[PDB]
Amino acid sequence: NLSELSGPWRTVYIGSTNPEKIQENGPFRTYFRELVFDDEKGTVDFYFSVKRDGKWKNVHVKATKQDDGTYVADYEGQNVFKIVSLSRTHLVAHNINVDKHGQKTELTGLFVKLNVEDEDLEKFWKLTEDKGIDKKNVVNFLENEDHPHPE
Amino acid sequence: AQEEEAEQNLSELSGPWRTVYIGSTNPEKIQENGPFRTYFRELVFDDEKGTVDFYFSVKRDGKWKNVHVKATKQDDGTYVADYEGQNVFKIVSLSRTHLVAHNINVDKHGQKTELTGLFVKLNVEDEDLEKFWKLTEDKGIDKKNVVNFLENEDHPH
Ligand SMILES: CCCCc1nc(N)[se]c1CCC
Ligand SMILES: CCCCc1nc(N)[se]c1CCC
């Protein structure tokens, strides 16, 4: 039951046994946007952004769960990763990437979830109505293309 | 084992904040290039000075701008701030994770705009940080080889 963890997630820290993978232009200097867990298909879709070559790219990768519990996915090689601790607000993970040249890299990561509550959303909506504001004149900043760049 | 909560206070509320929704009686204010299409980065609450400092980014003209605005509390509990005119805003709901607010903006042309906003706080508990560090050490990853993506996002470009 990890479906309820789907939604907007943000990268906090990423560590690597190979600094080149996470320095500027590194393939694993990933800013998470959204995570989607599917308990029936045993899969996880990652939506994130990476500045590769000189520009920003939005990437989508689907990970599949294995009998051992680990997940495997194809991104800058073959990756096999393990969630170490999850909860409503956090995800600490460890990933093993093996690139095109057989180079093995171990990465670690802390990601936090952006939890928007119903109780709070409702309050926002009542207030927006009280001020006679039209739902059309409301901007969603969580799923917006027009956003700033961290680098 | 043991469960513990950090002692709360406006001080504990400071930190990274993100904007979820912003509503406006005047759509020009929050459209692309509008001064109120603001992406929050951090907020600093000061109990003693009765102030709140805002850090956010707005795409003005053709490029992104980081902006800092200090607001001061009033006896009536509202806050005043100077940004793209004069602003008086009231926090209708605040807790460890959310902020719902109502702002009244009078621009340099006498025009009044009323805005509504929902913001969410990005909380990072120490238990999680402590668990991320232990894992990092276990794989023999040296701290110098760790990037803080949160601070990068709070200090963009
Ligand atoms: C362990 C959860 C995140 C794994 C992971 N770390 C990245 N950095 Se991008 C990614 C998915 C694609 C390989
Ligand atoms: C009500 C607190 C947030 C008010 C507020 N909303 C923005 N949008 Se920018 C900002 C600070 C400058 C007036």
Residue A56: CB atoms within 10 Å: 12
CA atoms within 13 A on the CB side of B98: 18
Resolution reading in Å? 2.2
**Ligand 1: nearest atom to the Cα of A28:** 8
Q: Is A143 on the interface with B (CB under 8 A)?
A: no
Name the E strands within B13-145: 15-24, 39-46, 51-60, 63-73, 79-82, 86-94, 98-106, 112-121
Buried b (16+ CB within 10 A) or exposed e, B89-101: beebeeeebbbbb
* Facing B152 at nearest CB: one of A84, A89, A150: A150
Residue with tokens 């479906």: A3
* Facing B141 at nearest CB: one of A17, A132, A138: A17
The whole-angstrom separation of Cα A34 and Cα A36 is: 7
Nearest to A10 by CA among B104, B44, B16, B69: B16
Which CATH number belongs to the domain containing residue A10 in this structure?
A: 2.40.128.20
Q: What φ, ψ does residue A55 adopt, rounded to 5°?
A: -125, 170
The whole-angstrom separation of Cα A76 and Cα A66 is: 20
Q: What φ, ψ does residue A81 adopt, rounded to 5°?
A: -130, 160
Residue with tokens 């956090």: A90
The whole-angstrom separation of Cα A64 and Cα A79 is: 11
For ligand 1, atom 12, the nearest C-alpha belongs to: A75
Residue with tokens 């599949």: A64
- Does the beta carbon of A93 lie inside 6 Å of ligand 1? yes
A89: closest CA of chain B, how far (Å): 8
Cα–Cα distances in angstroms (integers) from residue A76 to residues A3, A114, B38, in the given order? 26, 27, 34
Nearest to B150 by CA among B126, B124, B119: B124
Scanning every residue of chain B, which has its alpha carbon at the shortest distance from the alpha carbon of A24? B147
Q: Which residues of A touch B149 (CB under 8 A)?
A: 10-14, 29, 31, 150
**Domain membership of residue A141 as a residue range:** 1-151
Tell me the technique behind this structure.
Answer: X-ray
Structure token pair of residue A8: 């907007």
Cα–Cα distances in angstroms (integers) from residue A99 to residues A14, A60, A77, in the given order? 18, 18, 4
DSSP H helices in chain A: 118-130
Q: Is B22 on the interface with A (CB under 8 A)?
A: yes
User: Identity (one letter) of the amino acid at A14?
Assistant: I
User: Identity (one letter) of the amino acid at B27?
Assistant: P
Nearest to A111 by CA among A31, A16, A25: A31
The whole-angstrom separation of Cα A73 and Cα A68 is: 15
Window 65-84 of B, Cβ < 8 Å to A? none
* 3-state DSSP of B8-48: CCHHHHCEEEEEEEEEECCHHHCCCCCCCCCEEEEEEEECC
Q: How far is the CA of A62 from the centre of ligand 1 (A)?
A: 10
Q: How far is the CA of A97 from the centre of ligand 2 (A)?
A: 43
Structure token pair of residue A113: 């979830």
CA atoms within 13 A on the CB side of B73: 12
Total count of domains within chain B: 1
Q: Are B48 and B153 in contact (CB under 8 A)?
A: no
Q: Are A10 and A32 in contact (CB under 8 A)?
A: yes
The whole-angstrom separation of Cα B82 and Cα A142 is: 26
Nearest to B83 by CA among B101, B70, B102, B100: B70
| CA-angle at B105, arms to B123 and B72, nearest 5° | 55
The whole-angstrom separation of Cα A151 and Cα B147 is: 13
Residue B31: CB atoms within 10 Å: 13
A141: closest CA of chain B, how far (Å): 5
Max Cα distance, chain B (Å): 61
In this complex, do A128 and B23 lie within 8 Å of one another by their Cβ atoms? yes
Chain A with chain B: Cβ pairs closer than 8 A: 163
The whole-angstrom separation of Cα A7 and Cα B98 is: 17
